[PDB]
Design a protein around this ligand. Structure first.
Ligand SMILES: [Zn+2]
Ligand SMILES: [Zn+2]
Ligand SMILES: [Zn+2]
Lengths: 7, 136
């Protein structure tokens, strides 16, 4: 899964 | 704290409907609209404000379950674009589940997967209806 850090 | 309350759920010492699955508040006054479990009014307020908010990457801004999170997994389903934070996944699906999902490619999220139940995370059979009322 792609991940990102939340804004 | 959500951690200990979920512990109790797993231990069958407490019903998941009686805890806010989003923040761990015991002051449950309503049902989480997407997953089996309770919800407090604070988190409802958060949900109404954050749900279906999107970043410039074309994916949702905040964790579907808790409307927060710091690292989130993104659903590959273009009809969905939801995300789930590592903390809710490890807590409710179970320890290691986040790492397991991160290595999966492609990955479709818990609001897409036909099985609908992943550990303690159970998708409501009627979530569109629930949602619609949540909003009204
Ligand atoms: Zn709450
Ligand atoms: Zn979360
Ligand atoms: Zn999805």
């Amino acid at each position: 899964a792609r991940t990102k850090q939340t804004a | 704290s959500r951690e200990r309350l979920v512990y109790e759920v797993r231990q069958k010492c407490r019903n998941i409907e009686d805890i806010c699955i989003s923040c761990g508040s015991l002051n449950v006054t309503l049902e989480h609209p997407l997953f089996v479990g309770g919800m407090c009014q604070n988190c409802k307020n958060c949900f109404l404000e954050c749900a279906y908010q999107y970043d410039d990457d074309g994916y949702q801004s905040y964790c579907t379950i808790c409307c927060g999170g710091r690292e989130v997994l993104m659903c590959d389903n273009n009809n969905c674009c939801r995300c789930f934070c590592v903390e809710c996944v490890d807590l409710l699906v179970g320890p290691g589940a986040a790492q397991a999902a991160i290595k999966e490619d492609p990955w479709n999220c818990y609001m897409c997967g036909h099985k609908g139940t992943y550990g303690l995370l159970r998708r409501r059979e009627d979530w569109p209806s629930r949602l619609q009322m949540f909003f009204a």
